[PDB]
Design a protein around this ligand. Structure first.
Ligand code: SF4
Ligand code: SF4
Ligand code: FCO
Ligand code: F3S
Ligand SMILES: [Mg+2]
Ligand code: NI
Lengths: 544, 262
């Protein structure tokens, strides 16, 4: 039975920690259950405003700085955007290289999210100190692949290091943790806490390697520097030695995914099976990613290996094609000027206007993206439902595997547990595809090393750039006039998931997902974190 | 138990790329740094506590008897009484002001905290400023967008164990920022011989010719990128792309257009 108090009243959590950026969550609680919610983004920067009048070639370098967690993705979306505006189709090698860098980003981003952002909501680190390192090793030898990191010796060494750290009195990043002293909402046995904590620390080393792999093609991480209008600049990234080192690093990262991430995920999901009934939404959108034909946005949507689509009312029998004309953003409940509702991004307007904290009429720096009046969840769970519904072979196999291991129906994936599982599921699938994708590019680049197409700047034009970033459906939209930026609008996965109410007063995905959240302890409302963290919030992304 | 120096890390108007850069450190790795070298006592990106718990961890850090060092990531949005950038219902400018007041030292990680950064670029709708400017305090600047973790962690270690490092006119440690990117660039002999790529599709580009004609800002940018590389493997020019000048103050406006020299 899921713990829940009798608490009735408001709860504000600000800051929401272990996300990117600046988020305030406000809820009304009755009888220990959330009955209303508000997602309030607390920073504005105004990149869209900054871009006005600038060189379209410069856009990618500004927009990349929307986010350093989902680094790269905005540079890619802007490049796709401007390629489409100047009507250039990139060479095959450039499509391949840009897509591999995205694959590398997914691996880095998802791994860090699970361990370093999300796990502390489910894992009680201090209780790891109660475990017998030997019983824990035994448990790990029965729920996971054999590995030296999982030995009694290795787990004792982890425990010893943590013990010395805690007994020092300087708890650092664990100061005032919601799990300190025990918490009713934390179910894991001490042994699982120890295993997960050991992997948390290993993950801190492994993400360096994931980033090195990414930097071989991207030039550096964070903030890649290899994309240009018409393709890519990195001729060395098509050669044999760097691609062999890229393959090897990727294999090490994927071994860690298969040995640690997925088994930890499934163990947590096993103990928190009640969270498969908490935090569901109904509508899903993806632009798709990993396309075999990126010559146009329409081709991207059509040929993405992680497919695009639109699911409404949880109906997996009816995946609709993406209508890019049906996207618009409202500002009714946002800190922008009157009269900006219902704008398609090509006609987007960014006129900031602040009021006051917790003004129920205006409470976020995020706009509210809508699709034919409806809010849309984007991200791994959206991609997973869409791919599954379309019978994408890798997704079908892995989803059904997870469902078989957990003994739950596919309908239990419309939940915070599902959202968390989905992130792991697609990580395994990206990992399974890496060697094939690298071989494709090595083989292609060795026959011909064309990486960038010739192009000309038009006087007046418009273009859209689509990508499914780690957090979901991302689009950059440009109006060019006089060879300059006349308008540049970003509509970002977190804007979809975490923005405020639309013009109809309808709650966003995160706000909807928060309703019915049980709160065991209003002093320490970890359940709010669990659902919010599950969406992988990125506020600098959502607001830009 | 040996007491480890307290570090408070504040996030203002930023993209969290500097936090991400920092955790790419391998000398030492971040786990070893925070378990053995420092006491990282507030850090929104990775800390366990949230909301009021987190706010109280900050207060506890700020009132620590042994004092603390301050790391600041991001610029300060000053329009409307600082209300366009808030944490825990307080303007970023207000919290950074209060934390700076008693800090043993202030390290600005990234071009944003150092100089104002991307949000400060024209027309600067949020009236964003760098820290030194907004608060009136001396900062140790570790710029770049993001800086190399070698530079940040090196500065942090140096300040904890040796003192304040020698700084150039822009507040940057000469240890890392003393030389131009250009002076250590392997394409330099191409530059000297006027061997330039005219476009990215050209045979000259394939041959690794200099990128000056394609807007490279190495000749006017102080950083150690070609010497230390990023992620142990690469840097932008090696990846065939011009330097953006991203460690220079206000580069968003002084270095643009990026693909030109005008
Ligand atoms: S300096 Fe660059 S990487 Fe660092 S916070 Fe500012 S925009 Fe992000
Ligand atoms: S590519 Fe840039 S840093 Fe290198 S020699 Fe040419 S101008 Fe200098
Ligand atoms: N992934 C990611 Fe960042 C967000 N939200 C983007 O785009
Ligand atoms: S863009 Fe920045 S990271 Fe180095 S190569 Fe130029 S200073
Ligand atoms: Mg926008
Ligand atoms: Ni992001």
């Amino acid at each position: 039975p899921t713990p829940q108090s009798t608490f009735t009243g408001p709860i504000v959590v600000d800051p929401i920690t272990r996300i990117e950026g600046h988020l305030r969550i406000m809820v009304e609680v009755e009888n220990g259950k959330v009955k209303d919610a508000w997602s309030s983004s607390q920073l504005f920067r105004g990149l869209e405003i900054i871009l006005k009048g600038r060189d379209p070639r410069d856009a990618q370098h500004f927009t990349q700085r929307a986010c350093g967690i989902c680094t790269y993705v905005h540079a890619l979306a802007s490049s796709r955007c401007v390629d489409d505006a100047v009507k250039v189709s990139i060479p095959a090698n450039a499509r391949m290289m840009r897509n591999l860098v995205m694959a590398s980003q997914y691996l880095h981003d998802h791994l860090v999210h699970f361990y370093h952002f999300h796990a502390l909501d489910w894992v009680d680190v201090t209780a790891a100190l109660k475990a017998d390192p030997n019983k824990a090793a035994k448990l790990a030898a029965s729920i996971a692949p054999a590995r030296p990191g999982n030995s009694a010796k290795a787990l004792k060494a982890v425990q010893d290091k943590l013990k010395a750290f805690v007994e020092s009195g300087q708890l650092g990043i664990f100061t005032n943790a919601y799990f300190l002293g025990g918490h009713k909402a934390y179910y894991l046995p001490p042994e699982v806490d120890l295993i997960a904590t050991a992997h948390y620390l290993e993950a801190l080393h492994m993400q360096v390697k994931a980033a090195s792999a990414m930097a071989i093609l991207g030039g550096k991480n964070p903030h890649t520097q290899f994309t240009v209008v018409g393709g890519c600049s990195n001729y060395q990234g098509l050669t044999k030695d760097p691609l062999a080192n890229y393959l090897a690093l990727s294999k090490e990262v994927c071994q860690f995914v298969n040995e640690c991430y997925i088994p930890d995920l499934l163990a947590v999901a096993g103990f928190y099976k009640d969270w498969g009934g908490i935090g569901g939404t109904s509508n899903y959108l993806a632009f798709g990613e990993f396309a075999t034909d990126d010559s146009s946005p329409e081709k991207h949507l059509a040929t993405s290996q992680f497919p695009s689509g639109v699911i409404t009312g949880r109906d997996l029998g009816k995946v609709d094609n993406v209508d890019l004309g049906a996207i618009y953003e409202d500002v009714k409940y946002s800190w922008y000027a009157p009269g900006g509702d219902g704008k398609h991004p090509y006609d987007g307007v960014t006129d900031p206007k602040y009021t006051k904290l917790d003004d129920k009429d205006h409470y976020s720096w995020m706009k509210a993206p809508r699709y034919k009046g409806k809010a849309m969840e984007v991200g791994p769970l959206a991609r997973t439902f869409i791919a599954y519904a379309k019978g994408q072979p890798d997704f079908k196999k892995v989803v059904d595997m997870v469902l078989g291991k957990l003994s739950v129906p596919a309908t239990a994936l419309h939940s915070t547990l599902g959202r968390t599982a989905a992130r792991g599921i697609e990580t395994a699938i990206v990992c399974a595809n890496m060697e094939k994708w690298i071989k494709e590019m090595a083989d292609s680049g060795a026959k011909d090393n064309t990486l960038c197409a010739k192009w000309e700047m038009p006087e007046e034009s418009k273009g859209v750039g689509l990508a499914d970033a780690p957090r979901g459906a991302l689009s950059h939209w440009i109006r060019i006039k006089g060879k300059k930026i006349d308008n540049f609008q970003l509509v970002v996965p977190s804007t979809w998931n975490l923005g405020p109410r639309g013009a109809q007063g309808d709650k966003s995905p995160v706000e909807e997902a928060l309703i019915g959240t049980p709160i065991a302890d209003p002093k320490r409302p970890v359940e709010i974190l669990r659902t919010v963290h599950a969406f992988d919030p990125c506020i600098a992304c959502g607001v830009h | 138990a040996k007491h480890r120096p307290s570090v408070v890390w504040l996030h203002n108007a930023e993209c969290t790329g500097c936090t991400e850069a920092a955790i790419r450190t391998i000398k030492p790795y971040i786990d070893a740094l925070i378990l053995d070298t420092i006491s990282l006592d507030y850090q929104e990106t990775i800390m366990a506590a949230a909301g009021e718990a987190a706010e109280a961890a900050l207060h506890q850090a700020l009132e620590g008897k042994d004092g603390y060092y301050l790391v600041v990531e991001g610029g300060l949005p000053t329009i409307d009484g600082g209300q366009w950038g808030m944490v825990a219902g307080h303007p970023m400018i207000e919290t950074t002001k209060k934390a700076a007041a008693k800090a043993k030292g202030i390290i600005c990680i990234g071009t944003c905290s150092a100089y104002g950064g991307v949000q400060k670029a024209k027309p600067n709708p949020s009236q964003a400023k760098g820290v030194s400017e907004a608060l009136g305090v001396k900062t140790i600047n570790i710029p770049g967008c993001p800086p190399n973790p070698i530079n940040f962690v090196g500065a942090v270690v140096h300040v904890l164990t040796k003192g304040i490092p020698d700084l150039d006119e822009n507040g940057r440690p000469k240890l890392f920022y003393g030389e131009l990117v250009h002076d250590n660039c392997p394409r330099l002999p191409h530059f000297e011989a006027s061997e330039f790529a005219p476009s990215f599709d050209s045979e000259e580009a394939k041959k690794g010719f200099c990128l000056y004609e394609l807007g490279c800002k190495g000749p006017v940018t102080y950083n150690n990128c070609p010497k230390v590389l990023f992620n142990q493997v690469n840097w932008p020019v090696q990846a065939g792309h011009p330097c953006l000048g991203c460690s220079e103050p206000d580069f968003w406006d002084t270095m643009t257009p990026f693909y030109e020299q005008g």
